[PDB]
Amino acid sequence: TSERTFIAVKPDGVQRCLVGEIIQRFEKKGYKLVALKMLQPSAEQAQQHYIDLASKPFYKDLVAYFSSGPIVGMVWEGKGVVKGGRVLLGATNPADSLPGTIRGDFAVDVGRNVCHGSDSVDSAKREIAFWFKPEELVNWTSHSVKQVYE
Amino acid sequence: TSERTFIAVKPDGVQRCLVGEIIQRFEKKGYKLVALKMLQPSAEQAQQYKDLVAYFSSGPIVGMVWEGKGVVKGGRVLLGATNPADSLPGTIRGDFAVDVGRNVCHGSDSVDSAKREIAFWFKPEELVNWTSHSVKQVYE
Amino acid sequence: TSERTFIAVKPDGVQRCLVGEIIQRFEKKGYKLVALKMLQPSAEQAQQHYIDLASKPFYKDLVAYFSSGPIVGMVWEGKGVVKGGRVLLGATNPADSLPGTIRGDFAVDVGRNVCHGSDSVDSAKREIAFWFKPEELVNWTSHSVKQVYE
Amino acid sequence: MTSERTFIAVKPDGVQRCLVGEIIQRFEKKGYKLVALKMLQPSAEQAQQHYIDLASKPFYKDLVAYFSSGPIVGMVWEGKGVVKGGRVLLGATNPADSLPGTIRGDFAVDVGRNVCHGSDSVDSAKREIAFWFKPEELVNWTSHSVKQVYE
Amino acid sequence: TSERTFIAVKPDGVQRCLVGEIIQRFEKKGYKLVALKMLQPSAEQAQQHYIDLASKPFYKDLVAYFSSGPIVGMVWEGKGVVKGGRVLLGATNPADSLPGTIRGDFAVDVGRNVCHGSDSVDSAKREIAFWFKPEELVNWTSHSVKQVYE
Amino acid sequence: MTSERTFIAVKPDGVQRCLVGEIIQRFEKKGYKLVALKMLQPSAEQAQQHYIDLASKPFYKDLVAYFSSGPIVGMVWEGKGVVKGGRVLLGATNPADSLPGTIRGDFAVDVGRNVCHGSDSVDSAKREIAFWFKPEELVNWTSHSVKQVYE
């Protein structure tokens, strides 16, 4: 399948040097990287990233942090890559994260949870369009596509 | 002590360079490697659509025999759930595989099946009897 | 918080060269190493028991092993470090332990399960005091704390 | 000294052979700072510029075909001697001469599939960086670890 | 590219749980594994394996020991490979090995130097012929061969 | 023969940059034996003394300040050649020189912040072990793998 998910390294992940590890885990799974960019999100951008929230919202902080510095944003392609991406990442809240997952291994606070994954197929479609220009998605074939899948 | 399991890296694990990574995970767990062969399976050896004979015998595999307490289940825990979609991160199929069709390794379902599977793949001879210098650190 | 826990690398764990490995999983989750030392337990040091304690199936030689070579004792600090600490160690019984955890990855036998972590905030407080002069113990601020927590 | 920038690309073999995370993580953990990062397929014009040098075939039209036959990952890194240090991290250009521990030392066999490139000087770095990235793709930020890494 | 070497994990490496690690290093390099087996050398085989002695009674010691328990034996194929393999191993003498190499990372003592690789293409084929029956030797094509070479 | 003992310290930059585990783990994997291990915060005197063949330098005041600025992790490792081996694992004292594969090679950029320390001689080690530790903190044990590492 050519299903795609959007994966970001939040600025706390870039700050504590987890960009490479994160990409590597997706690469090791057999998912394919079709878009990669480092950019510091707008306040505007950050606001739409969160679009929910809330009572307590703040919120305003989760916007401040998210545009505090660089994120590495990604597009990953493969069968069940949206689902499978979420599993790779772990529970949103690191305290509820399984060990051997990104948050499971490398994160404590839900408020500093290292990375982002789309939760649904449509959520990814929206998200990729938002972060990446069509021309920044590279269409290519893995020499290994027939060893991962049939 | 002294239960033995059979593990194999399928052609897709061997192609994708996961032989060291699988072996290493078994070694650090404290299990003892007892037999090791790279071979290309031949047509017949397909055990029970009906691709998986073009596939399972299209390229070399690494067969292995491992030894230790709970090694049937523990081994299969190590590989994780047969279906990569069900496999969890930290496990071989969880970390490395996507498709049931291309699930990298294999692990014997019962103590029973293990010995059928060892016998099938190995002469009782290719099978090395040694004692780990760590046996006393890993076990009581 | 700020909550502290007690982690020990058991003699089999030291013997099997898992000290760096263990330390590193905690450093990498974001927990903070607040005290650390190698020692050989004395036999009444040994546990002491008083966990069980009511000694109990066959203490005699569980307390003989725990005292038979060196262990590495450590105190890590952070939110839920007590609970999360146990998570990294994995299920007390190696056979229940998930791959991705210290015991899951490295341990086969309960009698030789590499490590111990305090079982509650309360057990910790005690074990920390029993193992550590209250001053072998460093108060420092991680340059990463703002990145690990909001 | 510390704001020095260098250009590092994982080449199309490296992307294919799934070594993007491997290489990036070697840089992050040396203490260097990721200042830009993207994925692109080089265009034939981008590919010819990369290898102007040789033209002068040798494997010109070949190298150009290869380098623009799939995605590469470009990056800009920043740190003290990051230009010199990057290349040390990547290993000697000819993999046959590179030492284990280095990217090419660990994962590469023949020079025409040497997995990556790094800028060879302050002045070639600055050029390549200017070449591959619009200046608004260079993110300007401070590592919370910069004082741990430098005096 | 056709050129093949013999690589052996000596009994210390097998004992010290270094078999997967060594294999991994050759897979990651791009070399192809065209044969593999575990066996316990006889004194005869260990005696042959050593050109060597002649002695200083470290022969005999080498000869025992080497037949002390199982070795893991391998044949690797890549644009040779014999040289490149030895480079992955590190200087035969561990005191001279650099970090990054197998012996660099794991060996201290020449008598326990973990592993072996043939010193020449001709030496290689003796060793391959000596250790392997010509049909224990799968000819196959790595799906990556075109990414590791031109 | 030996046996033989050296002193390895993770500098406070190394502790800060979460590399205690990684460093210990290299010594373990190498066959060396860890016979003492504690974390402590160096006092100005201890700091001042460590940077002794260095007391008449521009940096020093800053090095002392830094070394006592927060916790270090001190170790005593035992095994044949360990003083020289321990430093090879560590890599050239100045990062710009150290090779990938080594601790400073993989993880450090500048001398001020070079992460770790190993005694330079058999004698230095013995000064440093006696200084940083007390005999009773120095365990005496035998590794089950000792026979596998040494012939």
mmCIF file of all heavy atoms in Angstrom, chain A residues 143-145 147, chain E residues 143-145 147:
data_model
loop_
_atom_site.group_PDB
_atom_site.id
_atom_site.type_symbol
_atom_site.label_atom_id
_atom_site.label_comp_id
_atom_site.label_asym_id
_atom_site.label_seq_id
_atom_site.Cartn_x
_atom_site.Cartn_y
_atom_site.Cartn_z
ATOM 1 N N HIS A 143 14.360 -0.125 -3.362
ATOM 2 C CA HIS A 143 14.875 -1.347 -3.976
ATOM 3 C C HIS A 143 14.359 -2.580 -3.209
ATOM 4 O O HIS A 143 14.368 -3.696 -3.736
ATOM 5 C CB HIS A 143 16.410 -1.329 -4.122
ATOM 6 C CG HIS A 143 17.151 -1.546 -2.836
ATOM 7 N ND1 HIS A 143 17.202 -0.597 -1.835
ATOM 8 C CD2 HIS A 143 17.863 -2.609 -2.382
ATOM 9 C CE1 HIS A 143 17.905 -1.068 -0.820
ATOM 10 N NE2 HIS A 143 18.323 -2.284 -1.128
ATOM 11 N N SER A 144 13.862 -2.343 -1.993
ATOM 12 C CA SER A 144 13.433 -3.400 -1.057
ATOM 13 C C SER A 144 11.921 -3.590 -0.906
ATOM 14 O O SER A 144 11.476 -4.388 -0.071
ATOM 15 C CB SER A 144 14.043 -3.161 0.329
ATOM 16 O OG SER A 144 15.459 -3.140 0.274
ATOM 17 N N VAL A 145 11.136 -2.880 -1.714
ATOM 18 C CA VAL A 145 9.686 -3.003 -1.659
ATOM 19 C C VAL A 145 9.188 -4.471 -1.750
ATOM 20 O O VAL A 145 8.220 -4.832 -1.105
ATOM 21 C CB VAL A 145 8.996 -2.065 -2.697
ATOM 22 C CG1 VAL A 145 9.244 -2.515 -4.117
ATOM 23 C CG2 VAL A 145 7.486 -1.908 -2.411
ATOM 24 N N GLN A 147 10.685 -7.142 -0.556
ATOM 25 C CA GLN A 147 11.203 -7.948 0.572
ATOM 26 C C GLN A 147 10.422 -7.616 1.823
ATOM 27 O O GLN A 147 10.347 -8.418 2.758
ATOM 28 C CB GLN A 147 12.689 -7.684 0.820
ATOM 29 C CG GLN A 147 13.584 -7.809 -0.405
ATOM 30 C CD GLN A 147 13.920 -9.249 -0.746
ATOM 31 O OE1 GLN A 147 13.560 -10.177 -0.021
ATOM 32 N NE2 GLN A 147 14.616 -9.442 -1.847
ATOM 33 N N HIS E 143 19.301 -8.524 -3.009
ATOM 34 C CA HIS E 143 18.439 -7.611 -3.766
ATOM 35 C C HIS E 143 19.027 -6.207 -3.751
ATOM 36 O O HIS E 143 18.521 -5.325 -4.436
ATOM 37 C CB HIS E 143 17.042 -7.572 -3.188
ATOM 38 C CG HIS E 143 16.947 -6.785 -1.922
ATOM 39 N ND1 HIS E 143 17.775 -7.011 -0.846
ATOM 40 C CD2 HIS E 143 16.133 -5.767 -1.562
ATOM 41 C CE1 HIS E 143 17.474 -6.169 0.125
ATOM 42 N NE2 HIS E 143 16.481 -5.403 -0.284
ATOM 43 N N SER E 144 20.096 -6.023 -2.973
ATOM 44 C CA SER E 144 20.716 -4.720 -2.790
ATOM 45 C C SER E 144 22.006 -4.577 -3.576
ATOM 46 O O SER E 144 22.652 -3.524 -3.535
ATOM 47 C CB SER E 144 21.022 -4.481 -1.315
ATOM 48 O OG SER E 144 19.836 -4.399 -0.555
ATOM 49 N N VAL E 145 22.385 -5.627 -4.291
ATOM 50 C CA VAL E 145 23.695 -5.646 -4.908
ATOM 51 C C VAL E 145 23.934 -4.412 -5.775
ATOM 52 O O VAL E 145 25.026 -3.839 -5.755
ATOM 53 C CB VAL E 145 23.995 -7.003 -5.626
ATOM 54 C CG1 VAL E 145 23.068 -7.240 -6.794
ATOM 55 C CG2 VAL E 145 25.456 -7.085 -6.074
ATOM 56 N N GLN E 147 22.796 -1.450 -5.291
ATOM 57 C CA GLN E 147 22.919 -0.274 -4.413
ATOM 58 C C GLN E 147 24.266 -0.231 -3.708
ATOM 59 O O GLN E 147 24.748 0.849 -3.362
ATOM 60 C CB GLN E 147 21.809 -0.241 -3.355
ATOM 61 C CG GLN E 147 20.375 -0.252 -3.887
ATOM 62 C CD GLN E 147 19.939 1.046 -4.554
ATOM 63 O OE1 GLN E 147 20.665 2.031 -4.609
ATOM 64 N NE2 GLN E 147 18.721 1.045 -5.045
#
